[PDB]
Amino acid sequence: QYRIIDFKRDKDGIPGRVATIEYDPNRSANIALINYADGEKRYIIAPKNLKVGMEIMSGPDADIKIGNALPLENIPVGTLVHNIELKPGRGGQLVRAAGTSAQVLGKEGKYVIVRLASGEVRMILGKCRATVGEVGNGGRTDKPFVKAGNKHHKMKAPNVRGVAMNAVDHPFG
Amino acid sequence: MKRTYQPNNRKRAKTHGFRARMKTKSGRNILARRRAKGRHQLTVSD
RNA sequence: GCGGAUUUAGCUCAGUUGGGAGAGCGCCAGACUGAAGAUCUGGAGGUCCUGUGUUCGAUCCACAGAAUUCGCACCA
RNA sequence: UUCUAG
RNA sequence: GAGCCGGUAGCGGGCGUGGAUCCCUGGAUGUCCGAAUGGGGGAACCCGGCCGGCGGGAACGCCGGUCACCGCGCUUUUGCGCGGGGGGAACCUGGGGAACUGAAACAUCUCAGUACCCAGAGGAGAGGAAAGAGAAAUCGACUCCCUGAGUAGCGGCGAGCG
RNA sequence: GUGGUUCGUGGAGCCAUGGGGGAAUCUGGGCGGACCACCGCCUAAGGCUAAGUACUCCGGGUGACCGAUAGCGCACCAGU
RNA sequence: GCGAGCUAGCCCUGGCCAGGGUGAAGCUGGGGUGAGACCCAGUGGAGGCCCGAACCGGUGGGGGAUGCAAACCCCUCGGAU
RNA sequence: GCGAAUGCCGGCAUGAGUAACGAUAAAGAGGGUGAGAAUCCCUCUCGCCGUAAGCCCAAGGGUUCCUACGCAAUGGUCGUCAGCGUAGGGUUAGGCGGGACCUAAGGUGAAGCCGAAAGGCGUAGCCGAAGGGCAGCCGGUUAAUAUUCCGGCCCUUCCCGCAGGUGCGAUGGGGGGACGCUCUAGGCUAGGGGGACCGGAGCCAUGGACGAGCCCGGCCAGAAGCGCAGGGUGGGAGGUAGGCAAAUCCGCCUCCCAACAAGCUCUGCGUGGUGGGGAAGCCCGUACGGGUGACAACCCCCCGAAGCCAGGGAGCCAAGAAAAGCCUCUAAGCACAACCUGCGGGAACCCGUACCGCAAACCGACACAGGUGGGCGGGUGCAAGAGCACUCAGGCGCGCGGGAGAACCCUCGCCAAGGAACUCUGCAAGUUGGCCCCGUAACUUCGGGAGAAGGGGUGCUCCCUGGGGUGAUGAGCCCCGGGGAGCCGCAGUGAACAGGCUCUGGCGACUGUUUACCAAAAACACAGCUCUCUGCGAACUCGUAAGAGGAGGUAUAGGGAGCGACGCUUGCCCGGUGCCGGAAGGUCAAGGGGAGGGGUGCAAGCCCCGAACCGAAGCCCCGGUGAACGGCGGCCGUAACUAUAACGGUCCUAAGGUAGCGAAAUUCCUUGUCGGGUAAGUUCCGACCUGCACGAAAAGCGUAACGACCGGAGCGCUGUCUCGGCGAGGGACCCGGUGAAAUUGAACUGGCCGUGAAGAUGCGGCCUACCCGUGGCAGGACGAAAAGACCCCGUGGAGCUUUACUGCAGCCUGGUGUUGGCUCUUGGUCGCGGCGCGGCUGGGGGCCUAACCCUCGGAUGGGGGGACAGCGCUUGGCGGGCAGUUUGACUGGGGCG
């Protein structure tokens, strides 16, 4: 419903309980309200799995318990993640419903290796974080916009195209 | 038929009105232009 | 009707001191083989378009003409 | 590599 | 110096040589807008603290005065007391700054440092006692008029600029 | 690397500066047009300075200047 | 310098589509197999979906040409959550 | 010193007493006033609305509104009429709307951030609305106002007092107001309908009936008290590793009461009690009638919302805005005086109202059949419905009236007999048009093509029968069959609104969207594919540097793109070009860096030219590259009794068209040749296929459904046509009233055959030839419109294009700067193939790091990067993205030549 919310933990020792299935319409991410100890909440990432009955978190410590997330430092090798913590705390550093996250495919000193979900590879840094678990996007692909144009229903630009025009109009155009 | 005249108090006013002109460099300009220059009254005055 | 190029021993093609002419694939004779063929052995052969001009001498340098392939024939 | 029918 | 309540000549009423109309200059009022500046805003409207009479408050309580924008100095203390800003036909320097058109094209060039826009000083700014000019060991502030001179000279050495 | 200057890249200086190096306090330090010797001038890298020239909104004067389609367009409940 | 009370857009915020028709996901029940696939029947009510007013339009013909009008009148037509 | 510039300005004639009265929703009659009335006032027939030609709220316009006088001009005629003139007068609110309250976009904007200056952005706070919020309603009352004035009924906020009560006491917090769409239960006013059931004013004329007969109405609003009706939340303790920066609030975990319980916000009764109440109505206009007095009446059943309770419930996906009130509390003061309550007195503003308002008062310059946003929109009939025909309330007759009825244009109605042959074309029109039943083909992505195609039904009468709302159900109402019998007309959706269908082909799939005043299409758009730049502080787009956008997106993503469902399938070539990679080698800018020469120099010196070598991208050179640009051979021979071909011979190219298709909208020789369709068919449609010049990605062959697309054919049907011929309404014509307009030197303007500058009323010869007019018919006056758009000419202009010229924007790039340390290293060089050293100086590899930047993540500290780079200066390069010029003459037309 035209809004944002959470995207980056950094208060820990906190109790992570899988709020609920609030599959969400606004970023290809499907998240559920994450119930913290105090009671303070957050429509959190959609890293598939972690059943309703919440039951997680993270921590400077550890707990690969699927989903969840800590610094690079605190992370296995051969592991699949998201909550792409690029720079030191820059919260998320990639993978948006981009299921196929990154896989600490080898780390090095204040530098941890990452399979570039998108489609390449290089390294991050020290404390830098990132929570494993999948994504959530049920292949959020495909699906037919049949005899109409989902598009429009887009609210998402018919910013339509052209290219053939009659003129000689717009940038590199 | 829809000409182009339908005036809109709110509108026309707003849009044009002592102020504005003022607020502006330009506006201001001509304005004090008109002023002397011509005499008369002015927009909003309208 | 105009502009470019081409008309060489059966066929596709090469040659700007021009002064003395070939290449690959045909055609006849001799070998290999019981036999043809492919393949090794030698030769026979042309107005370098028709008719002229400059020049010692040019078909390769030049001016007309027939036949050849291609372009041009668009504006109202 | 090929070389008709009786 | 003896007539007047403006252009209105008209009705109805009136001031005046114990110096009216009007001519001057210095006044006190100067409602609302406009830099506006207390606050808001489609100008000429609608909103707020302090003082204020106290005011009809017939046995019941309000306008008026006021006040305060913000950038400037700095007696800094908790900052109290001075300047500004908005104008303005034309003219002035700085800041920025163009094609036409000429060259019988047009890229150099010209129109020009013009036209315009901007800022800002003034009643005038501009500028102004020389590391200047030139060469007779000569001259001397800056400015402006004539002259020097359409010369010395700049240049697709062309139009021109000069 | 641009300016202004008569100088449009030129034998091309002075003064002014966009970037980078970054001297001297009187035998110092620019200058008289590449530069160099000698001569001659001047003394910077802060500031103020009325008067002599420019301009008419304003007021006056004067006209081989006009007369209501001329003059400012507008001689009077016109920049309406 | 002047303009989106022209028009093309885009942001914000309300209003508006008379009636009717077609009948997919589903859920209920029944159906030979292990469960099912899957069938059928009921319910059900989607779709830039159909038939059509207002409303949005303005092909196809008619008039009009110093018009009613610097684009309009007439018959006709498309769209119609 | 002026005809004279389609000259400017002013007047003035033309056509011309012809053309027009702004919708073909018509009028006509009697009286009245007046100088004078088709055009005013009263009255009586008549026509048009009626979803409007209704009242209403707005926005816009602002006295246009009323009343008494008046018509000079505006009223396209009059005119005593006016939305025209002068004069006077009219619109009042604690509760309606705007503010004294709130914010999103957006705009402003102290601080902050960047510009040559003007300026740009912009936090918080503020501006900003029919979005949020907020305390009333019905009747009366003037010439006009009214939810404001009357009155009857219903309230709210602030203040002072006292009475009672309780930790009151910020806006900081928390809930909180808060919402999408499509759909639907339960209940109820609005609204409608039957009542012969109640009240009352008169009737019946006519044949008939005084009868459940005709005609009016039988309602509107309300303290709470009160039962149908829902509508929103649960209730205690404790822990509060403690949040929502600070504690009791709410958020989160644990144990008990965890209902149809109790809770708190709209409709019915009602009913306090008020009003209205028509038909009156004795005084009174018995008539511009009604102002105001009987009595009224005051009731039942029926239908029932597309938004009344309500923030419903159910489904769905594209998954639905922020600040007053309520409770928690710090600062803080009350805490015998702070807030809640009760009663009594006291206070309540600023500006808005008239009338118009699907419009002569609003935009179109005009009383112009143009547009302009919301509210039920009365009924009867038709399956329903703001569609339709008639009409209710209220509105109006278009502001020019008579009179003839000729041609002729308009709009409309009809036909035999034929029934498209008319013609480019069934363009038009006419067929057909509504609901029910029966019945439905090729093809299909099985949804559809079906309303397909093709029939048949419908009216009013009586009979017996079955259903769902009807509080049981018993004058009441509805959906409905049923089946039987029967009546009438040419006809029985009787009128009115209402598909012609089919057979085929081509393109584009489809609903679309678009060139406002020609073109709605095969044009774009697409859902869908493929290459593809991009790792964030993205890449591209605006920007002078900030900055926004991007995106609080993050490779199932964001931008660049050529096609444009789906199906089937996209082959061959990287020699040139763009690009991606390479960077060893050539080149080459600024620059370092020295041989050497030169000028002056008595001399130390003092200026230049300077070159060997080191030196950047770029370009050259190697490769990779096609849903990147682009391109994808020629002729001679041969079984072929005749023809490419199965094969063979070759010269050039980067290979040298593949699968599908084919005279297609790419095929001019052509109406190509064969076939079908026909009385013949240069359109079609099938097939060949020597494809003048298809072809896979600006796709290629096909493709259900789909189209106001285009073309081809058949039935059905009709004046489209064989000529039509009749008619109805409207101008045109005659009358009265009004009364333009472009063009025009001027003119009393005949035909001829000849002529002239070669298409003459005006010149020659001749022949007909009285003067004027009106209703017409087009030929000539080279008629009107417009100093040709087609043309060329001006070394005119303006837009797009690429290997045109140049230059800039941006981008890449060497050295240089605020860009600091530490170490690992190889190269040059001159000196003393060499090695040792030496100054020189060049390359480069590293965490760091103190600039710089960024970073943040809750503070100024940490973190990341870091000598980058941003960024400044010079270098060089790409560079049509843009800016400015240019691209000759001849020419027996411009060009090509």
Q: Which residue in this structure is represented by tokens 């005499």?
A: B39
Domain that holds residue B13: 1-46
Read off the amino acid at residue A109.
G
In total, chain A counts a number of residues equal to: 173
Spatial neighbors of A71 by CB under 8 A, at least 6 apart, are A60, A85, A126, A127, A128, A129, A130
A79: its two tokens? 């592991």
- Determine how many CB atoms are found less than 10 A away from the CB of residue A100: 15
Q: How far is the CA of B15 from the C1' of H91 (A)?
A: 32
Calpha distance A76→A14 (Å, rounded): 22
How far is residue A132's CA from residue A135's CA, in Å, rounded to a whole number? Answer: 9
Cα A104 to Cα B14: distance, rounded to the nearest angstrom? 61
> What does strand F contact on the protein, if contact means CB under 7 A?
B 37-41
Tell me the CA–C1' distance in angstroms for B40 and H359: 34
Q: How many domains does chain B have?
A: 1
Instruction: List protein-proximal bases of chain E (any atom < 7 A from a CB).
Output: 33-36, 41-44, 87-89, 117-119
Q: How far is CA A96 from CA A48, B21, B38, in A?
A: 12, 49, 65
CA–C1' nearest nucleotide, residue B41: F79
- Asked if residues A106 and A77 have their Cβ atoms less than 8 Å apart, the reply is yes
Q: What is chain B's Cα-based Rg?
A: 12
Contact A91, A44 (CB under 8 A): no
List Cα–Cα distances, A134 to A57, A77, A80, in angstroms.
15, 16, 7
**In sequence order, what DSSP letters do the residues of chain A get, joined into one string?**
------------S---B-------SSSS----B-B-SSS---B----S-S-SS----B-SS----SS-BEESSS--SS--B-S---STT-S--S-SS--S-B---SEETBEEEEEETTTEEEE--SS-EE-BS----STT------SS-HHHHTT-------SS-SS--SS--
Structure tokens at A81: 């993640």
User: Dihedral of CA A126/A129/A135/A140: which sign?
Assistant: negative
**Way it was determined:** X-ray
- Contact (Cβ atoms closer than 8 angstroms) between residue A71 and residue A85: yes
Q: What is the CATH number of the domain that holds B8?
A: 1.10.287.3980
